[PDB]
Every structure is written in C-alpha cells, then in structure tokens.
From a paper:
Aside from teaming up with various ubiquitin ligases, UBR4 activity is linked to two specific cofactors: calcium-binding protein calmodulin (CALM1) and KCMF1 (13, 16, 17, 20, 21). The architecture of the E4 megacomplex is conserved across eukaryotes, but species-specific adaptations allow UBR4 to perform its precisely tuned quality-control function in diverse cellular environments.
Although the nematode E4 complex preserves the ring shape of the human enzyme, it displays notable adaptations, particularly in the dimerization interfaces that result in different topologies of the ring-shaped arena. Proteomic analysis of purified CeUBR4 pointed to a distinct substrate preference, with mitochondrial medium-chain acyl-CoA dehydrogenase (ACADM) showing stronger enrichment compared to SSBP1, which is preferred by the human UBR4 complex. In line with this finding, we observed well-defined extra density in the central arena of CeUBR4, closely resembling the elongated shape of an orphaned subunit from the tetrameric ACADM complex. According to the cryo-EM data, the bound substrate not only contacts the ZZ domain but also two long helices in the N-terminal region. Organism specific variations illustrate this principle: in plants, specificity depends on an internal AtUBR4 ZZ motif, whereas in nematodes two elongated helices at the N-terminus extend into the central cavity to capture substrates, presumably recognizing the hydrophobic surface of orphaned proteins. The functional importance of the ring architecture is emphasized by its conserved shape and dimension in CeUBR4, despite pronounced differences in its helical scaffold and dimerization interfaces.
Numbering used by the authors:
A (entry chain A), B (entry chain B): 2 to 101, 117 to 218, 229 to 324, 364 to 552, 561 to 654, 657 to 883, 890 to 961, 972 to 1018, ...
Amino acid sequence: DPRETAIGLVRYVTENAAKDFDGESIAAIIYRLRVVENYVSSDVDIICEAMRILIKKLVNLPPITFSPDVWMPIMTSITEGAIEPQWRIMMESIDISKFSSTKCSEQITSICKGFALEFGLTRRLFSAIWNTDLEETARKMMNQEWDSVKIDSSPDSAKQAAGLIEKSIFDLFSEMKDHETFANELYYAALARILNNSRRLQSFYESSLHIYDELIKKLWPHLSKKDPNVKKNTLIIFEKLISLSPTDVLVQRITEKFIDSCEWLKISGEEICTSMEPRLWKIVGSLVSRILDLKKTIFLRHMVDSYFQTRSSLLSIIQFLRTAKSSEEIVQFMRVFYPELVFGNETLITHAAIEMLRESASHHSIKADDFISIVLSVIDAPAIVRIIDVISCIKDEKVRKEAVEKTIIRMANDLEDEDQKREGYVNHLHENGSFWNDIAKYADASILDKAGKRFVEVSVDSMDIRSSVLATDIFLTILKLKLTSEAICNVSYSNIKIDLEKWNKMGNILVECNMVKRSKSEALPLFTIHQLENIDLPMRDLVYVVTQMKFLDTKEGMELHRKFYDGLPGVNVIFEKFMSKKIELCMKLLDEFAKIIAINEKSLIFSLDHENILDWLEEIGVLDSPQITEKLVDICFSIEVWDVLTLLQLDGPECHYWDLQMFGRFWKTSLMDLLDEKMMKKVNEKMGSILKEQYDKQSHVAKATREKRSNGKFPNRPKVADWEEQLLLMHNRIAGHLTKKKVEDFADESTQKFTWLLGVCSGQMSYKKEVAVDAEKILSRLYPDAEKRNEVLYHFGVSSILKGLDRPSLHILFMQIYLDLVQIDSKSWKIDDSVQKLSRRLGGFNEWLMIVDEEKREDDGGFRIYIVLNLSHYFWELLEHAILKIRKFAEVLASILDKITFWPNPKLHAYYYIAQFLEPLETIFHFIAEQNRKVIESFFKQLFDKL
Amino acid sequence: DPRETAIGLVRYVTENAAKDFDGESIAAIIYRLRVVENYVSSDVDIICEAMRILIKKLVNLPPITFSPDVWMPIMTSITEGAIEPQWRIMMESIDISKFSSTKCSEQITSICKGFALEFGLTRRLFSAIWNTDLEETARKMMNQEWDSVKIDSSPDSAKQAAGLIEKSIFDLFSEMKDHETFANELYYAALARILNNSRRLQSFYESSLHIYDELIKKLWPHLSKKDPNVKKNTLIIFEKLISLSPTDVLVQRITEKFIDSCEWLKISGEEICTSMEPRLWKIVGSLVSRILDLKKTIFLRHMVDSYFQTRSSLLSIIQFLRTAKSSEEIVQFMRVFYPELVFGNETLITHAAIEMLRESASHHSIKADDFISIVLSVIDAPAIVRIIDVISCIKDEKVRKEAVEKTIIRMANDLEDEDQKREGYVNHLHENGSFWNDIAKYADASILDKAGKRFVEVSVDSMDIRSSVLATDIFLTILKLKLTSEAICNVSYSNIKIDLEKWNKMGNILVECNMVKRSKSEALPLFTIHQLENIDLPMRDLVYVVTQMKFLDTKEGMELHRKFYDGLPGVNVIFEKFMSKKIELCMKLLDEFAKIIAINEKSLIFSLDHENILDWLEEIGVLDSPQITEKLVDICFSIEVWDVLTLLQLDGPECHYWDLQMFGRFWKTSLMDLLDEKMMKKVNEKMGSILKEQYDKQSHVAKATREKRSNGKFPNRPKVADWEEQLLLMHNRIAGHLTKKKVEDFADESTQKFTWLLGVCSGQMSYKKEVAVDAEKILSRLYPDAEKRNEVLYHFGVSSILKGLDRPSLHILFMQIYLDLVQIDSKSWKIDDSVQKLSRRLGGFNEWLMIVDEEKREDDGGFRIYIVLNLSHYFWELLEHAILKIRKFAEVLASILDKITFWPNPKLHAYYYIAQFLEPLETIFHFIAEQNRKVIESFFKQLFDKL
C-alpha cells in the first residue's frame, strides 16, 4: 500500500530531520508522498511538517544538484499537485528500502504552496534553471561588471520562465523573503539575458524581450521601493545595449522597450535626456531613416503596423527631447531631418519639434546664422506653407524681420522661374488669414513698402493673367494690411519707381481682381492714371470707372488716391477734371453696351445688376442730362433688334442692323391689321423657306444648339432663358427716364426720340401694355385729332419700310409686300384727294424720288425704278372704284415724273426700264396732260439726253 | 479640462488632509480623479498620496453613510478602474466649486489597489453592505448571543458577496490587517446569515449555503491559526442549526455542509461524535428515511443524483459514528434501521456499520438479549445470507453458539413452511464455503450433532425431492465438517432417534446426492440398512451399491460405517454377510440392465462409464465366477436385439423379444447367401409395406422424431448418435470375458452360451470381424471337420427360424421364406440320404412335430399343420432331380406321420387340414408303404378317433 510506505518515509524524515540527504532521495520521497491520493485528515499534520522539512533541506542543495527538466515537475507537484508522467518514469527507478477524499490532497497541496512561498523556492528554481546566482549578477551589474557574465540565456529557458510567471505564487509577490531584493535581481538577470543574447550574435531576441516585458509588467510596483539607484542602472544598461546593436530594427525595438521602461519606472524626460543625449542622437537618426524608408514604401499587412509603431517611437523620444539643452543638436535636427519629416505628411512630430524649438529659443538665444540656414533650407523645399511656424519660432525681432523678408523674396523667386507646382503652393499659402495676421504682427512698415514694390514689379512683369491677378489682389491686401503695433496706407507710387506706361497696363488686372475675384465688400477700387487722364478706354475699365466712381466720392477714396499718388505733378488737375461733368464716359459706355447687345455677344455687364441701370445714372446725378436720353433711345432701339433676333431664331451678325430693325417694325403692329390671310400664308412660307436656307447654311454645332433652344418653329417663340428676362425688364423700365416733362421734349418732329415714340405707339412687340398706353396717351397729347394721328402712323410705317431698302431674299419679299399693301390701300382713296396726300400714303414717295445725288445713283440696285414699274404695271393691267384708283395714281405719277430721270444707274438695265416707262405715260395721257406740259417736255428731253 | 480640475482638487485635499469631509464630497472627488484618463507620469505621486488620504478618510466614515449600490461602483473604480454609468449619472449632479498613456492610469489603479489592501477596505465594504459590525457579531457568537442578531441576510446581498469574492484582492488574504480576525468574523457572519435565514422561514437557502461554501473554500487555511476554539463554535452553531430545521431535505443539505466543514477544519470523527451524539441520531433517522424513500422510488434525472448525495452523507456520518460510545444507540440502530438498509441493496454502509459493531463489541460487552434481538430481527427478514457477518460480530463464545443454533433453527423453520422464496435464499446461503468454514470455527460438536439430527428429520419429512436432496447433501457436508478447535465423525445414528423404516427411505435421496448432485471426489457414499440387509433392491441403489462397494473396502468406509451405526445390534453380521460372496446382487443388476437395454429406455447407467463394465467385475474379483457368464451372454443377446431395433427404425416395445431376436438371426448371416434376387425383392417389399403400416399407426411426435433421425429408408442404417457407439464398444469388449479357457466351457451343447457362440460364428451384424474370426477359430476347435460345422450351422439357423414361430404380418413372411429356403435346399439332397439327416436339414422337424402336450395343443395357430400342408402342396404340384426330391420328402413324411395326429387344435379348421392330408399320403403310397405299415394304420385310427 503506498500510504503505509509514505507514512514510514515521513516517520523516517521526522526522526532524521537533522541529517543531510542526497537530492535524489529527497525527490523520491517527495514523489512518493505526492502520488498517494487516499490520505486521511488525521495524518495531514505530520506529512506537512515532513514536506516543510524536505523543502528546507532542498533549498540548501547546491544549484547543480538537478537539471531544469527535473527541477520543473517537482515544483509542479509541490505547488499544484500535477504529476508529470516522465517524471514518474525517472523517479520509480530509485529504491527506498533503506529509507523505509481529495480534500486532504488539495489541503496538502495548498499548505505546501504556503510553505514554499515562505521559504522562497521561486528564487532557487530561477537560479537553478538559469545557471546563475541572482544576487551575484545583480551586485556585479550594480558595480558595472560585464566581462564576467555567467548565465544561460537560451530561448527555451526563457520559454520556461514565461511558462512559470503566470501561476498564483507570483500573485503574492510581496510575501516571499526579501521580495524587493529578489525583484531587483530578477530585473537585473533579465537585463543580463538581453546583454548576453546581444553579445552572442556579434527571432534571436523575441523571447528575451517578451520575458523582460512580462517581468517588468509584474514587477514595476516593487523595483523602486528599496533601491533608489534602479533608474540610473537601467540608464547605463541601455546606454550600452543600444550602442551594441548592429541593425536599425533591433535599435527601434529596444528603444521601444525603454520607452516602456521609462513609463513603468516613472522616469521623466528631463533626466533621461540629460543622461543619454549622445547615443540618443544616433538612435534618432537610425529610427528616422526607418520612418523615411517606410513612408517611401507607403503577411504583407505588417508594412503598416510596424510603421505606426516606429512613428510612435519618435513621438516618445521627441517628447523626451522636450528640454534638450544642446541648441546645436536641435538646430542641426531642424536643418537636416525636419524637411523630410514634413515631407512624410506627419503633423504631430513636426508639431512637437516646433514647440521644443520655441522653448529652446525662449531659454537660449540661438545664433541667427543657424536660424537663417534652417529657414532657407525649409524655403529651399517646396513646403512654404509651414514656414510661418518657424518664423514664429524666431524670438529675435531683427531675425524675424529678416526671415520674413527672405521668405517673401523666396516666393517671389518661386513665381519668377514659372513652375506650376510652386505657384500652386504659393496660392494655398495665401488662402489663409492667420498667415497675414502673423505677417502684420511681425513685419514693420518698410517690409510692407518693399513687398508692395517688388510685388507690383512681378505683377507688371508677369505675362500670365492668373499670376498678375494674384499679384494685384495680394498687393491690395498688403496695402490694407493693418499693423498691430501701428494700430492705413502702406505702399506709395513714388517708391515703386516704375514707368507710367507700364503702370497703365495694371488697369485690366485691377478690373479682374476687384469685380471677378473679390466680393463687393472686400473690393478695393483703384484706378491707374491712364484711366484718370483718358476717356478713350476699353469697356473693361469703362465699366470699372462707371461702377466704382462712387468710391472717389467718399472721403476715404479721395484720401487714399491722393496719398498713394503723392509726389506726382498735376494729380489735382486730373482729379478736378474727372470730378467735372465723365458725361462723355457715359455716352461711350452706353454706345458700347448698345453695340454689344446688337451683336448677341456675352459681356460681364450682364452679370452685374443692369436691370436697375436707371438707378446708376441717378447715383451720379446725370439722369437729368438731356444729351444722354438720345443715347438712351439708341439703347432701346438696339435691345429691340436684339429681341427680333431672339424671335427669328436666327442669331449671329450675318445681317445688318437696319434689316432686322425694319423687320422688327414689320411685326404685329397695326400695319398688318389691313392684310389678308393669303398674304400671311405667302409671307410665312417665304420667311420659313429663307430661314431654313440660312439654317442648313450653318455648321453642326450651331444647329444642335438652335435645335436644343427652339421648342417650336416660326412663329412660335423659342424657349426663354434667364438673361433675356433681365434685359426685357430694364428695357421696359427705361420709361422712368422717358417722362421728360409733358409735351415739349417730343414736340421736335425731326428727332430720334420722335421716331422711337412713333414706333412704340403702334405695335412694337417687346414693350408691355403699360408703355404702349403711355405712348398712346402722349401721342394723344401731341396729336389731339385721331385722323392725323393714324395718317402719320401709316406714313411712318410705309416710310420706314421704304428707307430700310437702301443698303442691301428678304428684300424681294419686302418689295412684294410693299406692292401688296399699296394694292390694299388703293381701295380707300377719295376722288378729291390731293397729290401730296397720295404721296404721303405711298410713304415719303415725293421726297424719296427727288433725291438726285451722285451717291444715290452710285451702286443703287434700281429699287426706285423697280417700284415705279411694278405699280405702273399692275395699274396698267387693271386699266386694260378702279377708275378712281387709276386716276389718283396717274395724278401722283404726273406730279413726280420730272424727277425720276436722274435715278437710272449706268450699271443696271437702264434702257430696259426707260422703255418700260410706256405704261405710266399711257395712263397719264388717257386724261392732266394739259395742266402738266413743261414737266412732260423736260422728262422727254432728259430721256433723250440719256441716250 | 478635467485634468486641471482633478489637479486642483488633489491640491485641495493635500492642504486639507487634516479636515473632515462629507462622504458625498469624497466620492465626488474619487469619481472625478478616476474619470481623468490623460494623466502624466509626473503627477502620479501627488495623486496617489491624494487618494490614500481619501481612502483613509473614507474608512473612518460611519457605515450608514452610503447604500450598497453606491458602495459598489466606488470600490470598482478604486480597485480595477471600471466606471459604472449610473454611478457617473449620480455623481455628476454634485457641485465641486467649493473644493476647486493608459500606463499612468493602470499604475494609478494598481497603486490604489495596494493602498486599499493595506488599509483593509474589504472589511468596511462587507460591514456596510451587510448592515452589521463583523467584530461584534463574531464576539457575540463566541459568547453564544443569538437573540440580538442584527444583520442583513437578503439573497441579493449574498449575490453581491459572491460577485465580490472572485477578484484578486482576496488572492492576498494574508496581507490585509488582522486577516485572521477578519477571517473569523467573516466565517461567523456567514454562519449568522444561515441562522437568520433559517429563523425567518419559521430556494430560500441556496445562496446562503453557496456563499458560505465559497467563503470556507477561500478561508480554510487561516481560520485555525489564531482562534483554537473555532471547531467548538462550529459544533454549537450547527447543533442549533440542525435542530431548527423543519424538513428533512434541509437537514440533509446542511449535514452535507458540516461533512464538508469537518473535512475543511480538520475535525476527526471522534470529537464531533462525542459532542453531537443526541441530535445526530435524529438527523440519521431523517436522512435514512430519505434514503428509504429514494430507494423505493428507484428535469426527472435528478431523482438519482440527490440519491447518491444522500447516500454519501450516510457514508460520512457512519464514518463519524465509528467510535460511537453509546452501545444502546448502535444496538437499536441495528435492530430497527439495519434490515431496511440491507434491503436497499447497498453494501458499503452496512459494511461499515458491521465493523463499528465489532469495534463496539471489542471495547464494550453488549447484553446478550440485545444481540439475540437483533439477530432474530435479521433472521425474521428473508435476508439470511449476511447473518454470518453479525454472527462474527458476536464476541461472546456462548452467545455465538446460541446465535448459530437459533439461525439454523430459523432456516429449518423457513424450509418447513414451504415458501419458494425462502428456499431459494437458503440454497444461495449454502452455495459458499466461507460460511461453512465460519460455522466450523464457531460451533462445537453438540451443535453439529443437533444439526444432523434436525436435518435428517427434515430430509425424511420432506416430500419434495429437491428439498430432501439438499438436506441430505448438506447433512453429508456437516458430517465431514472439520472443526478447527478439534483439528472425523459428527453425527451418529443413535442420536437421531428415528424409526428404521423411514431411514430405509433415505437411500434414493443418497443416490441422487452422491452421483447426480455431487462430483466423484466430494461424493460421500453411505448406505442405509435397507440396502445392507436386502438384495431385492430397485436398480437405483443397485447401481449405487455396485459402484460404491469399493468404498467399504477402504478402512475409512468400514470405520465410519461402524462408528455411525454404533449401538445397533447385529451390524457386524450384516457387514460380514455383504462382505461374503453380492453375487446375486450382480445377477439382478445385470438382469435389470439387460431388460432395460431390451426396451430402449433411458437409464442413468448410460451416463456412467459402462464401456469398461468388464473392469467393474474385475474390481470386485468375481470376473472368474462362472454363474455370471451365463447372464453375460444374456446381456450380449439383449444388446443384439437392441441393435436390431436400431436398424429397423422401429423402436418401442410393441413386439416381443423373440420376434426381434429371430429377425436379428434372420440377417446377413450365410443363411441368405443361398437366396436369390426375386426373393430379396419380395421380402424387402413386404418388410417395407409392414414397416410403413406400423409407421403411420404411430403419432405425429414419434413420426417427426423418426423422420429427423432417419436419413434413409430400409435397408440404409439411420443416423448414428453417440450412446450407441458406447454400447457397441462394450458389447464387442465382452470377448475379454469370453476367453474362458480353451474348449471345455463351450463343449456343453445344451447351453445358452453355445447358442450365442453358434449365432456369432456365422453372421451376427453387430459383432466386429475380430470377434467373428475368434468365434470361427473356437468353432474350428469344437468342430475340426467343416462338413459337420456347416451342417450344424444350417440346422441352427432353420431351427431358430422354427422356434421363433411359437408365440405370436411378419409371421406370414417368415412362413413364406421358410418354405422358400426349403425349396432352395431341396436341390442339394442325395439319393442315399437318411430320414434323420433330412429332418435335420428341415430343422428340428422330427423333434418339433413329436411334442404332444396339452399346452402345445393349447392356443396353437396350427403352424405345424400349415407348414406340413404347404410343403406337401408344393411337392404335389411338382409331382403332378425332381423325383429324388419328392422321394426324400416322402421318406421324411412317412417317418413322421404317426406324430402329426396329436397336434390339430379343436378351435381351428382341424377337419379341413385333416382332409388336406390327401397329398402327402398320395406321395407316400406312390412307392415305402410296405416297410411302414403299423405307422399308417395307427395314423388312420387316430384320424378316425378324431371324428
């Protein structure tokens, strides 16, 4: 029975407790009293005193008594009661004849655990497995003795230690003997393991660092209690362990280990930095090289993970270089590694380096040469956005000023060599307001003056419109830059020392900067002397002057113009001559606006609030000026023809102004109340055919655009966009300036405004019913009688039709409908009518055919003879109410006959129409010949002279 | 920023460390310095001194400062740093204006854990949640103060305690202040919880017992260090807690709890038993009632589990009643609960109760009345197999003797009332040898004598053969029972005092016991005086005497027969008269064996080794006796007819011995070498027809058995079983006893052995070729000449055929073949033959027809006249070599004629055959009539007298 044998062995131990036994026998006794599992509660006490005696004897054994694989199972059995099988294999071979409920067993195990805790077996086990004496190695590395290292640092022993560290006996670390000293010697033995494995290698370090990390994690609360020199010892042990590292990966891992250590042992950055600055610089260089390589590159997922770790390592060491006293070290760091560090697109580390630079500057005055070197090296790099940080790092006012001027010169040079990348960087740098706030609270006045001068120089030297525009805008901002110390004019023209002719070029750039790029509030209107001295300006600065001439009215504008243009002779005379009644400027601006509306061309005036253009002329106060209103009606006329080109779906300036004007006067006006439906059919068909012929004459892109725009063919109006609504709105508003008193302004018959009024009275489409009724009322004021009111309206319509045919598919149609409206009218003639009234109904017929001039004869297509022959031919056909019509026409022809002679041009078939004159003379001689004789003879004489 | 506010609060604490603050403010400060997570390694020291100050102040707070649900999260935060959300909800409502890496946080948490360990916050938390002072309740139950209990024992507080017990602060139980005292007060507070929840209830106890078990599991190593009175306090606390339990389930659970406790606190059975015997008895009664109910019965799987537990509870408490000093208690336990405990079919608990009974008997002398009461109560129960255990428990020799005699009387009474169950129990009890070894080493001689007397009484009084057989066998065993003290005759006939006529009946029971039940070695042959005085015995004890008469030859048998039959007059005369030449016993035994082989009946002689029966007669020495050999040949003859009944597939004694005997002599013997193939066909067909007629006359079971046995019909032999091989083997062996000298024994012609020898010489099938050639050689010795050798063989065959037809479908066939063999033979007759030789060839013809007796005439079927008429008829047909045949037959008939007159019986058609006599007389008178005249006249005179 095993229990009896165990009892006998226990008795043998109790009576032989003062004797010394070989370790093998002790191990055999231990094994045999563990393997028994049928113990009783009665004999537990004697056996526990037995095994405390055995454990006390075992601790006294020399370390070389057993091997680690035999040391392991005995501890297993005496701590948790687990029995390893190969252990029982080895132990059953030992003879012991010379020495001869599970609750009892677990009580025995726990009591043995308590006794093993009291007698401190863990230290003995560690010393045995590691083949070293922990106290001796701890003492020797207290004394820095590294050439006499005697310890096993094999990976499997590290595995065994790690497999130890997790049981519960270490949960009670503050209960074993000299637990602080034992803790210290464990820490130093782990450090000596790292040292041994580092020295041997002169996968290889993973287990060592792992077991060291586990040891420090379990041991931090007790290392700092007894020995206050632990921190310094860790500092020296690593100040070698770093220096013995061959490769950079090793270095970064172990520096991570001491980042951890300084975290555990509560070591602030100041002490470590002041005691390890020399090696730290090398370590920093190697690790930052690793960061650079890993950023360049940025089982294959590790390439990011390690990246993060290494970066965090920097984040720690820079935080340990927070109070780095060596200014030279941090200066050379900024000079060499900071550029690429910024290039790594990492902000935290740069950010901290910046603050430690500012702290080093506050505590110590670094040489200006060093700081200008680092600034230029940063200026050299295409990173010019963060430079302001190191500019704020400049604690010297003079250095700050010189650094700012060097940086501005550098960006000027960057814009000079014309590389897109640098230009983009400069644009981003000038997109923030904190930069300019810092520039204001750093730089002084002279810096602003030189910046303005150089910057106007680059603006005038820049051919690229974008670069010049940016230059002018930022020049405007630096002109209005408020200095904090001085808290405004910052650049004067005299200091620029530039020729005036090139300063004249800046006007367009100023237009672009002040209305295109900038908003209304931040717009800073300025005018170069080319504008202030001339009226013959392009519409760009014409619009500029018209819309920012209110800015000179304010005292601020006049003041800054005077102070900026100070030193230039005659400036006062210029100012008074533009304050003087600019009226010609208004005329030319409105003329250009008229012709630009006449050609269907896009202009930036449309983007402005032109709908209240009448308000604009009210701001200056020339709304009462009469010479403007003429031009005003011109505007109206032109917008009218624009509307026509909108309705025709024609677009483009392929036809002259008068053609489309007379086509506009050709519309729904009461002139076509008299016409019949067959007439409409023929005119619409011919208009559609000629419009289609024009359409297929165009290109494919224009046809696609017109098809997209047009929802329906003639006469349906195409789709309406937005801008035409604005144009129409301001067009109808003109009436605000058309009041012009009661009747006296329009009483002059021979005025363009009178022609406009006659046009608007009857049927102009683009004008709304309110304007139409106002025009009708004012015409009622002019002509109280309605008979003359309609007579003059009809005469105006026909006369406009006739005059429009002077400067040449549409002319022939107009010929046709002129004939046709005459045919319609002829039914309404009275027998008692006069020849002058008939000529008036025919238009300006008498005055039209009496214009005998060389120019009128020149290049005429014979429209006059063509008309005369056409009506004469139709009346001749009728002759071969009707009698009254023929008689009145014959009266008219007899009255006019003596004038038609001068007209026959010598280029057209003059003789053919001379012969064709036979019908009119026949209808005259049917009755009239007796009263009109001299005319007849003179007519014949010039006719024969023509031969 | 929370960190600045926490720093300010920490400063406020440091300058106000000597002031007292309300607990709410302290909790708010704790919460706010926990919630901060951006701490620095620099300020860790000041904050840890801050919270040690706060914890020291908090410990000083009165227990009613907070509620448990507020006490919980603060401990959570200060031990593991986990923050409960509702806690932050409650704490954020407190204003603190008047007081104004995660590695740092975890260091803070671990340092706070260490400080909380040092200041012992766990005791304060327990006192707060349980609304009690642990020291006061521990002291009061040291002083046994139960009427002033003030504690909360709610289930949720138990849940909270259990949820506490598992963190790591309790891993260091030996580090908090007064950890032994705190351990004691925890144990006593848990006990007071059980007490409170037991008293309140005057599901309800599960959490309390669970938390108590967890507490004792974590707290056992420290409860016995300081206070040595813990064991007694647990004893009293349970000596009430058991006594206050209303139901038995509660009782069994809590007694399990103290089985556990005595296991943990190292309390041996002796102390607990001597201090708690009164209540333990009640507890034992209740739990054993539970075991009885659960055995009777033996989510529904629990009915077994609890069962086991409760049984284990008994296994513990009985082991704590090991040294129960009260003999009355254990005696009454055995008297009342032990029977049903045995009935529970559980052996461990009974087993231990038995040993504790023996220990109580060794230490203390229990009254004999108690032990006889418990024995009779066990004897009363049908469990009489284990009684021997309590008989060995009897330490008193006189009591042991009286208990043994009471038990034997009890089993005698059990066998008397004739209930099968009790008989089976007695048989099982007598099936073991340890029981009889114990009976021998316990009882004395007089016990054996009275057992033998009563047991012979029951054997002779038992009508059941099985009960009597068991009685006789066990009487034999108790007769040979060796007593250890006396170390053999144990029962004598005189003491039995039984009448001799009933003792004569025991013979058959002795046969059954000594050859059927018992083996050869343990067979104990005995013979009742009925056998020793008589020869007219049934074959049972005949076989017994023949096979165990060797047992008297040994001195042992004679000695035990004399000493057992001592006191009976004339025993010596009986012994000498059976030692005297038993020869008649042999004759009668062999006669019975012969007739039993003749009827195909199963007998147990077959199971014996009868194959060496010749050896048996050699053992006695009567193998030389001549009067046996006659009977021997009888045996042979009978086995022969048995073989015939085997070959015929007939079986059963439906035909007489002589019929089958003459059919056996009818077989392949040389008598049928003379017969031809048509004769074989007719005889085989008729035999098959009559055999089938016999077959379908039988029943279905016999036909099924015969069909299974017979693999083929006639003449193919059926399948051969085993026993016939044995019978045939001993049959052939007879020859060993047939040597009988050279020629002188068989020289007597008129002997049965001579008939057997004549039969074996020619053709008996069952005898092998060795016996056949031996018989031929011995017949060559008897008859050197071969002519007489074949003549007598032929005469024997025909004479056996004729004699077999005297005591009547097979007879008519025999008639036919007798005629037919005569026809065959008649061709071999010489002209010079004599009438006597011809009669010899015809068989015993002359001697056969001359037997004139009243018995021969009586009931004769007229076979003689039938034969005479049949051959006379065939020879008459031939008459109407042939002449020689007719002449020889006529000579024979003339010689015999004067004798055939006497035979005609008066029951059969006598006159018809008298008339049919005309053919023989005709063939006689064809020639012979002159030499035979007086015969003719006498024949005619008796013929006429017959009329």
